[PDB]
Amino acid sequence: MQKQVKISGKSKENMSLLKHLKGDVQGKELVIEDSIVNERWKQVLKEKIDIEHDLFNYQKNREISKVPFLPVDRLITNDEVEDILNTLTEVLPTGKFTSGPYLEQFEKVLSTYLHKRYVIATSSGTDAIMIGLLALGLNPGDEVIMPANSFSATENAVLASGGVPIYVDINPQTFCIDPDKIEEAITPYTKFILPVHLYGKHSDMQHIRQIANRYKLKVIEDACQGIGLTDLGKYADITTLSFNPYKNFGVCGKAGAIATDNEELAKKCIQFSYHGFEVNVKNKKVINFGFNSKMDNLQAAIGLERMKYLSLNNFKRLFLADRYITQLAELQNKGYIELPELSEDHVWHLFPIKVRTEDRADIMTKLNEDFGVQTDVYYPILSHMQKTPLVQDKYAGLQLVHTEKAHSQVLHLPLYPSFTLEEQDRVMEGLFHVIKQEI
Amino acid sequence: KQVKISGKSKENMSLLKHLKGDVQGKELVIEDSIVNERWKQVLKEKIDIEHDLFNYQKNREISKVPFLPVDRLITNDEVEDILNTLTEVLPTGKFTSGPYLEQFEKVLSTYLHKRYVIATSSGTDAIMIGLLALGLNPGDEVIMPANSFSATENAVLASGGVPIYVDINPQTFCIDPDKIEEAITPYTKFILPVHLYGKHSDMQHIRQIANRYKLKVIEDACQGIGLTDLGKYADITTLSFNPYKNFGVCGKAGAIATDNEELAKKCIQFSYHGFEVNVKNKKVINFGFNSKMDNLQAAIGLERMKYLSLNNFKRLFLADRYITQLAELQNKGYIELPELSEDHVWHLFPIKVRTEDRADIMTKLNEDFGVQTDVYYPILSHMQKTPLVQDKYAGLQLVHTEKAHSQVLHLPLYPSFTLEEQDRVMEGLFHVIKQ
Ligand SMILES: Cc1ncc(COP(=O)(O)O)c(CN)c1O
Ligand SMILES: Cc1ncc(COP(=O)(O)O)c(CN)c1O
Ligand SMILES: [Cl-]
Ligand SMILES: [Cl-]
Ligand SMILES: [Cl-]
Ligand SMILES: [Cl-]
Numbered sequence: 049m050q051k052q053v054k055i056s057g058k059s060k061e062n063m064s065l066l067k068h069l070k071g072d073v074q075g076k077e078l079v080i081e082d083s084i085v086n087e088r089w090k091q092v093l094k095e096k097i098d099i100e101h102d103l104f105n106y107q108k109n110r111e112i113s114k115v116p117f118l119p120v121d122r123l124i125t126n127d128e129v130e131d132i133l134n135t136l137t138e139v140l141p142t143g144k145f146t147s148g149p150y151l152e153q154f155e156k157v158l159s160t161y162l163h164k165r166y167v168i169a170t171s172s173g174t175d176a177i178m179i180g181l182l183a184l185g186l187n188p189g190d191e192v193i194m195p196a197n198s199f200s201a202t203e204n205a206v207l208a209s210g211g212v213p214i215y216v217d218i219n220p221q222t223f224c225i226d227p228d229k230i231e232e233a234i235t236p237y238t239k240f241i242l243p244v245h246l247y248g249k250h251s252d253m254q255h256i257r258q259i260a261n262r263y264k265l266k267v268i269e270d271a272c273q274g275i276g277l278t279d280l281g282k283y284a285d286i287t288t289l290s291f292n293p294y295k296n297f298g299v300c301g302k303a304g305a306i307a308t309d310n311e312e313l314a315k316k317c318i319q320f321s322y323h324g325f326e327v328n329v330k331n332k333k334v335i336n337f338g339f340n341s342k343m344d345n346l347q348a349a350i351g352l353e354r355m356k357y358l359s360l361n362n363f364k365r366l367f368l369a370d371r372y373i374t375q376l377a378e379l380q381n382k383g384y385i386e387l388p389e390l391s392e393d394h395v396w397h398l399f400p401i402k403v404r405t406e407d408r409a410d411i412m413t414k415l416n417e418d419f420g421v422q423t424d425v426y427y428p429i430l431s432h433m434q435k436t437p438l439v440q441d442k443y444a445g446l447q448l449v450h451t452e453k454a455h456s457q458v459l460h461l462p463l464y465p466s467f468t469l470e471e472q473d474r475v476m477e478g479l480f481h482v483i484k485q486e487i
Numbered sequence: 488k489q490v491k492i493s494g495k496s497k498e499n500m501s502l503l504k505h506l507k508g509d510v511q512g513k514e515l516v517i518e519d520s521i522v523n524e525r526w527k528q529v530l531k532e533k534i535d536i537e538h539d540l541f542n543y544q545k546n547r548e549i550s551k552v553p554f555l556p557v558d559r560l561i562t563n564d565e566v567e568d569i570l571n572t573l574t575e576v577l578p579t580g581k582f583t584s585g586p587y588l589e590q591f592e593k594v595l596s597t598y599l600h601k602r603y604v605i606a607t608s609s610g611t612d613a614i615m616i617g618l619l620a621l622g623l624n625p626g627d628e629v630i631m632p633a634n635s636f637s638a639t640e641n642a643v644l645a646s647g648g649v650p651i652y653v654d655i656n657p658q659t660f661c662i663d664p665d666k667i668e669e670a671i672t673p674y675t676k677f678i679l680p681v682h683l684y685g686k687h688s689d690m691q692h693i694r695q696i697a698n699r700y701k702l703k704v705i706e707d708a709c710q711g712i713g714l715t716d717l718g719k720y721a722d723i724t725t726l727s728f729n730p731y732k733n734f735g736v737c738g739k740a741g742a743i744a745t746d747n748e749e750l751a752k753k754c755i756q757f758s759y760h761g762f763e764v765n766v767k768n769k770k771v772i773n774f775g776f777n778s779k780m781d782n783l784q785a786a787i788g789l790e791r792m793k794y795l796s797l798n799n800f801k802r803l804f805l806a807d808r809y810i811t812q813l814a815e816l817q818n819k820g821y822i823e824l825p826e827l828s829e830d831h832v833w834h835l836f837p838i839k840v841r842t843e844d845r846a847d848i849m850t851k852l853n854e855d856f857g858v859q860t861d862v863y864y865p866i867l868s869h870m871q872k873t874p875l876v877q878d879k880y881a882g883l884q885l886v887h888t889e890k891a892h893s894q895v896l897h898l899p900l901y902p903s904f905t906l907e908e909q910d911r912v913m914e915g916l917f918h919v920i921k922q
Contacts, residue, residue, distance in 0.1 A: 120580035129577045136573065140566045143557035145730045145737040171608060171739065174777035188625075188647075200760045200770060207774035210647070293582045300582040301738070301781040302608065323611075323637045324873070331865050333637060336875040337644035340611035344738035427768050436761070438773040 055080045055089060057359025059250075060278035060392040062366050069097050084157055087356035103364055106469045114420035115462060115471045122466045123293060124300075124354075131353040132300065139349045148345030154352055155305075158289075164281055164307035166314035168321055169343035173272040173290025173304035175321075177205035179341060180286040180306050181240065183316035184266045186211050192240040193233050193265075195225040196431035197451055202244055202270050203431050207438075214238070215432055215443075220450040221386070223247060223400060223458070227255040231263075240266050245274035247426070247460075248296070248365075248397035249388075257283035272304065273397040276362045281307055286317075291343075291351060296365065296397055297358045299347040361465035365396040368463050368472065372399060375476050384483050386457075398426055402457040407486050411459065414485075419478035424460050488513050492530070494522045494796025496687075497715035499803050500829045506536060521594055524793035525564075526800075536804055540797075543906045551857040552899055552908045559903045560730060561737075561791075568790040569737065576786045585782030591789055592742075601718055601744035603751035605758055606780035610709040610727025610741035612758075614642035614679075616778060617723040617743050620753035621703045623648050623676065630670055630702075631679040632662040633868035634888050639681055639707050640868050644875075651675065652869050652880070657887040658826075660837065660895070661688040667696050677703045682711035684863070685733065685834035686825075694720035709741070710834040713799045718744060723754075728780075728788055733802065733834055734795045736788045740780045798902035802833040805900050805909065809836060812913050821920050823894075835863055836900040842893040848919055849896070856915040861897050 053064050055078060068074060074096050080086050092102070100106040139150065155167045170176045181192070188210035194202060196215040206213050216233050219226045223246045230241060241260055243251040251269070260267050271280055272290035275297050281287035291303040306317050316335075318327050324338030325331065373390050380387045386402035388394070403411055408425075415421040430451060432443045461475055490505050490512040491498060505511035515532065517523050529539055537543040576587065592604040607613045618629070625647030631639065633652040640650045653666045660683045667678065678697055680688040690706070697704050708717055709727035712734050718724035726732075728740040743754050753772075755764050761775030762768065807827055816822045823839035825831070840848055845862075852858040867888060869880040898912055 121578065122580065124577065124580045126578075132577060133570070133574065136570065140561065140569060140737070141558060141563070143559065143561045143730070146739060172777045200762070200768065201777060204760055204774045204776065208776060293580070300577070301783050302583060302777065323641055325637070331637065333866075333871040333873050336873050337641045339641070339645060340609045340638060340739065346738045429768055429770075434770040436770050436773050 050077050052079050053077055055086060055359070057081070057083070057085045057089075057276060057362060058278040059276055059362070059366075059395050062276075062363050063392045065363065066366055066370060069099055072096075083161065084352070084355055085161055085358045088360045092360065099367055100469060103360075103367070104469045108470055108473065110468075110470050112420075112471055112474045115422060115474050117422040117424050117460075117462050118294070118464060120293070123298075123464060125357075125466060128354055128357060131356070132350055135349050135353050136346075139346060145346045146342070146344055148348070150349035150352060151343060151345045154343070154348035157352065157355070158305055158307070162281060162287070162307050164287065165309045166307065166311065166317075168306045168314060168317045169348065170304045170306060170321060171341045171343055172302040173270075173288060173292065174201040174205055175339065175341040176288040176290070176304040176306045177202065177242075177268065177270060178209050179317055179320040179339065180268045180288055181206065181211060182209050182320050183306075183313055184240070184268060184286060186239065189237065190239045191235060191237040192242050193230055193238060194242040195244055195246070195451065196448055197223065197427070197455060198244040198246060198270065198431070199272075199427055200431075200434075201272075202242065206242070211240070212237070213431065215446060215448060217448045217450045218454065220454040221389075222249055222251075223454060224249055224251040225256075226450070227252045227259060230256065230259050234263055234265075238263065238265060240268060242268055242270060244270040245277065247400055248273050248277075248395035249391075250274065250277050250280075250393035253283040274395055276358070276395040277393065285310065285313065291347075296362055296395055297355060299351045299354060301344070301347050301350075303343045303347045303351070305343075357465075362395055364465040365463060368467060369394070369396040369399055371469070371472060372461060372463075372476070376401070376479065379480065379483055384487070396463060399461045399463040400458050401461060402454065403459050403483075404486075405453075405456040408457065408459060411482055411486065414482040415478050418482065419474065421475050421478045422462070425458060426460055430455055489516050490514065492517045492523060492526065492796070494518075494520065494526070494713065494799060495715045496713055496799070496803075496832050497829045499713075499796075499800050502800065503803055503807060506534060520598065520796075521789070521792055522598060522795040523797075526797045529797065537906060540801060540804070541906050545907060545910075547905070547907045549857075549908055549911050552859060552911050554859040554861050554897075554899050555731070555901065557730070560735075560901060562794075562903065565791055565794065568793070569787055572786050572790050573783075576783060582783045583779070583781055585785075587786035587789060588780060588782045591780070591785035594789065594792070595742055595744065599717060599724070599744050601724065602746045603744065603748065603754075605743040605751065605754045606785060607741040607743060607758060608778045608780060609739040610707075610725060610729065611638045611642050612776070612778040613725040613727075613741040613743045614639065614705065614707060615645050616754055616757045616776065617705050617725055618643060618648060618677065619646055619757050620743075620750055621677065621705060621723060626674060627676040628672060628674045629677040629679050630667055630675060632681055632683070632888070633885055634660065634864070634892060635681045635683060635707065635868070636864055637868075637871075638709070639679065643679070648677075649674070649879075650868065652883060652885060654885045655888045655891065657891040658823075659686055659688075660684060660891060661686055662693075663887070664689050664692040664696060667693070668700070671700055671702075675700070675702060677705060679705055679707060681707040682714065684837055685710045685714075685832040686828075687711065687714050687717075687830035690720040711832055713795065713832040714830060722747065723750065728784075733799055733832055734788075734792055736784045736791060738781070738784050738787075740784050740788065742780075794902075799832055801902045802900065805904060806831070806833040806836055808906070808909060809898060809900075809913070813838075813916065816917065816920060833900060836898045837895050838898060839891070839894040840896050842890075845894065845896060851919045851922075852915050855919070856911065858912055858915045859899070862895060863897055867892055
């Protein structure tokens with residue numbers, strides 16, 4: 049009796065798929081979930097697959113002299129462009145670019161994909177967080193517990209709506225908020241915990257929800273880099289997503305989403321997202337104010353096209369990350385670097401290794417100068433280290449030991465779905481070469 | 488001798504006079520501007536406006552006149568320009584930041600005669616960021632009218648500002664400068680006039696008051712693109728490029744324009760996460776937003792902007808045709824018509840009817856003649872049913888605003904509207920009012 053292998057495109061299921069697509073028999077046991085996110089799989093999976101050749105067109109003998117970290121022209125493929133041009137041919141003459149039926153359809157599709165009853169699509173991930181906090185009842189002075197290593201948009205969303213960030217240390221291996229440091233930071237002004245699934249890695253949400261239940265806190269998660277994570281939002285009151293062009297799934301402009309199972313909360317999000325108006329009643333305010341922060345109908349139509357590539361693209365990211373972890377194994381075994389763990393709760397938006405603090409600048413310089421290999425560090429400045437009057441006045445004396453140590457060690461290697469395996473070879477070879485010459 | 492064509496409201500008025508036989512000079516000179524590009528394909532020496540710009544079909548069968556059919560606010564010609572530019576934009580993979588964004592800001596700068604332009608994700612965001620850049624702190628008071636779209640007050644409230652509502656001039660629908668000083672308190676920091684319906688507020692008088700009391704002036708010109716001397720007396724000028732404006736993109740966008748460099752710097756910092764200008768991830772102020780205009784929309788706007796001068800002129804022609812053709816209804820005192828003024832771009836066309844008759848007029852136009860009208864906007868700021876209003880604005884009376892609010896009626900007016908539809912609107916109004 050054969051166990052079926054459900055292809056949802058989610059992170060846990062992709063992990064089994066990786067094993068099966070590596071093997072010789074790829075038959076009826078592989079069942080493609082009837083979803084828009086799986087559309088590009090449908091055609092690919094009609095035949096037996098060799099991953100290297102069929103998904104990556106591996107050309108080991110193609111000479112490579114430069115490896116850009118993130119060439120944006122390669123983040124969108126010719127087939128996506130043709131798809132998008134086709135849909136726009138129909139959307140443009142409708143004259144509906146802000147409100148419209150593609151926006152509504154896009155929200156339903158996300159709702160089904162996320163298993164969340166209500167989805168409110170927004171004009172950015174930053175707006176989603178900001179509106180989410182307000183809809184959850186954030187008042188000026190309310191404290192929000194969060195990590196200090198996220199992109200600046202996370203703290204800005206708290207600050208913009210009047211909140212007070214309270215920074216807490218991360219787990220230095222996962223780069224996510226350490227749930228064992230959270231309870232320490234709770235005061236009578238704490239109302240929120242805002243975990244970030246940094247680089248695509250899922251935070252320890254079950255533990256976080258336990259602390260939150262204990263102290264009656266609300267949980268809003270920044271999953272802007274985590275689309276595709278299995279069980280996303282299971283333990284959160286609000287989930288926020290970004291669809292900016294650099295994400296695992298993005299549109300052609302700024303956009304994001306709020307997702308929730310709570311109807312009263314959803315309604316408030318809608319009200320905040322559109323001028324404080326009663327839902328579907330233009331010009332009639334039912335709350336003090338709101339923003340102009342719904343997603344555009346035009347981007348929604350674009351999103352319905354690009355979403356067709358998501359499951360395949362997340363799978364290719366997983367393959368790339370597995371290949372890094374396996375081929376670089378020796379550098380970790382001998383204790384020169386730390387590799388991320390090949391886990392089910394990661395969608396590989398970014399790929400972090402850790403190197404020695406004292407060597408990082410030189411490792412980066414040598415990869416670039418000697419081998420044309422570009423790497424990067426997301427993000428260069430920690431929240432409590434920003435040179436702002438707020439930080440200077442209120443965040444002096446703060447020490448986050450693990451966060452600061454990890455921040456000095458982390459190095460991101462190129463990884464995106466249209467990256468080639470032969471570029472990756474170059475990255476890995478160069479890494480072996482420069483690390484060995486550090487010793 | 489030369490009749491210069493800028494596309495701006497004053498020159499448009501002289502062009503109109505000139506083309507109606509009232510000669511203003513000899514040689515038509517089309518200024519070399521992006522906003523005039525499409526004018527060049529239709530504007531000839533012996534132009535017949537009714538035929539050459541409107542393709543007037545006196546006898547075309549009409550059974551409905553929609554107030555604002557959104558599919559007709561973008562032409563087939565625009566759709567093709569847009570598809571063509573997107574064919575080149577899409578493969579670059581640059582959709583947020585990028586070179587079209589920078590070019591679009593440059594082009595707006597030249598057109599508006601403002602040194603710095605910061606293109607934003609919406610007009611609402613432009614106002615919000617402009618207020619903050621100008622130094623709005625929570626509790627600071629902002630003098631403003633109560634008859635604008637809710638976006639204006641929301642931009643103040645979102646940053647914790649405090650709206651102070653003042654009465655309007657009931658003929659112009661704009662903030663009455665003679666009611667401003669009255670409302671000034673030690674907490675007042677800004678005046679925020681609105682060029683409502685596309686009518687220019689009395690900015691000179693407003694600036695005199697501002698200087699006297701050391702206030703800042705940020706104007707909501709989201710409906711006023713094309714006004715001659717827009718921003719001459721303002722510290723910050725805000726625009727919207729939403730698809731319903733005199734010029735719009737294909738999504739949300741707006742702009743802040745200013746001549747002040749330090750202000751511009753602050754606007755950029757607030758518009759993008761509080762980062763140092765052009766230096767990602769390095770904050771120099773406490774926080775910012777994700778509120779720049781998208782590169783993709785700027786590519787679209789660079790195409791749609793080519794139709795602006797032509798479209799604004801068409802709006803003027805329509806407004807002038809309404810005012811001339813409906814004259815009798817005003818002469819006999821049945822309605823009031825807007826004044827044919829150089830300082831208007833006719834985003835909306837407001838007439839005034841009797842308070843007690845407006846509902847019936849609207850119903851009879853629609854039911855008997857399929858003529859749809861509307862009222863922008865249905866609810867005044869101090870009459871919204873919110874907790875802030877009940878706690879802060881209780882008992883406020885704005886006599887002229889409230890009266891005008893009960894009287895105003897908007898007639899269909901947009902660049903692609905037809906003269907045959909307009910005839911139906913006008914004959915309908917005559918037949919309804921007589922009866
Ligand atoms: C962790 C994180 N949170 C929030 C955001 C903000 O998302 P958006 O750009 O759609 O505003 C980003 C975008 N880089 C992000 O990476
Ligand atoms: C007078 C006025 N002010 C501000 C705005 C807000 O502009 P946007 O829709 O681009 O946010 C509008 C849009 N209707 C407006 O009409
Ligand atoms: Cl929904
Ligand atoms: Cl730092
Ligand atoms: Cl500029
Ligand atoms: Cl009202």
